[PDB]
Amino acid sequence: NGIVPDAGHQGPDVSAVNGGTQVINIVTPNNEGISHNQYQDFNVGKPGAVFNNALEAGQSQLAGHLNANSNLNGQAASLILNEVVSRNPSFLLGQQEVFGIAAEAVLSNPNGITCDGCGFINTSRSSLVVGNPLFENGQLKGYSTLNNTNLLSLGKNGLNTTGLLDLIAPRIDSRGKITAAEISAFTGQNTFSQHFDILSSQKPVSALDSYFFGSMQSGRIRIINTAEGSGVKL
Amino acid sequence: NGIVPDAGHQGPDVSAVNGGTQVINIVTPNNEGISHNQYQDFNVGKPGAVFNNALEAGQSQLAGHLNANSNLNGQAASLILNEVVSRNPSFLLGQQEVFGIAAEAVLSNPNGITCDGCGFINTSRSSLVVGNPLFENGQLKGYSTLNNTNLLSLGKNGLNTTGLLDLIAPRIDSRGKITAAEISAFTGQNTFSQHFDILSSQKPVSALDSYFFGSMQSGRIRIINTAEGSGVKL
């Protein structure tokens, strides 16, 4: 019951639950190569979840044998954008696997995101965005944490991935081991490009406190807090 | 007794002690604009220390009225490089002021550096390097932490500056509030350019553990640990 796709045009379809692991047929990539998937609820349990970006049947790590995704229409996604459209926050307690062609992945949930033992498999770049994507006539222009005060939380069991990692939120509270090739954490109220360049920043009414306890096993870490007067506690 | 200049050609001369604050006449800048100063001992107490990069007499913040530095020969330094040539580590318990023309400042001490309530005034960029500078026929080519396992320590009272801040050491242990326009921390055994670009990295025999407790009041923080297998604990 963790992942509940939206009933609208950008809602993906669940094809199976294999050992508690939900398998999601992501929607057709647009001309930008972006599969924009919308959910009333996006949560991942300990069995994890699989996003099917495959043009051939094969073996997944989390859900066994899976089929090609006919939604792809012969073109795999280069970016899998998962967006929660409701007021429900997201809890990630397991791995998210991209089955098939490797792609970038973004979870966007302006209501809040909590990781605790979550991770990403076969992902070149993975982003957690407590904020909303910005679209202009159907094309992705970036993301926004403007007017948002919600929290990205990482629990004791941390987060692991072999690719790049982006953490975008008004504030971040981390208590676990973050393992990634590179870690980028951007806090405060900002507008971002598609590539998470900071295009603008605003000062929040009250302080946006970010907390980092725990290890960070990465060769490169960058933390940008644009909330003037706030800080990054370690 | 904190700052003891070397007797050789790159040893500066102390001109005064004003309220316990040592005033150092840095040596003539070379053609690169680098004043390369060598010390048998480099320590700063609570009264702080002043480096005289002035072409006119004026008022310093820490040491009252000071004169022009005749060592400059009419050309202020663009980089003040302070290097300990002995086995003595460095303890910085106060502010270091550049009197006169603003400049970049680097403290190089391969034996270790400890900050506790230290800071930098009228400095565009300030660097603490547990490592040695690299010279090629008198020209500065960069810095090196190769084969070094010593520690850069920041105590409870932290470090403050309005300019940029570089922290270069085989490992860093910080327990206080670091305030700076931007913070760059590079750990592991590396060779650096003059601008602290990582040119090469080597794996240490044993782990080089870096620790960051405490606040970091900066808009941009980057931490690069090139020691594979080691991590950054927060």
UniProtKB/Swiss-Prot annotation, chains A, B:
<comment type="function">
    <text>Bacterial hemolysins are exotoxins that attack blood cell membranes and cause cell rupture by mechanisms not clearly defined.</text>
</comment>
<protein>
    <recommendedName>
        <fullName>Hemolysin</fullName>
    </recommendedName>
</protein>
<comment type="function">
    <text>Cell-bound hemolysin, which releases heme-iron from erythrocytes by interaction with the erythrocyte membrane. HpmA requires HpmB function.</text>
</comment>
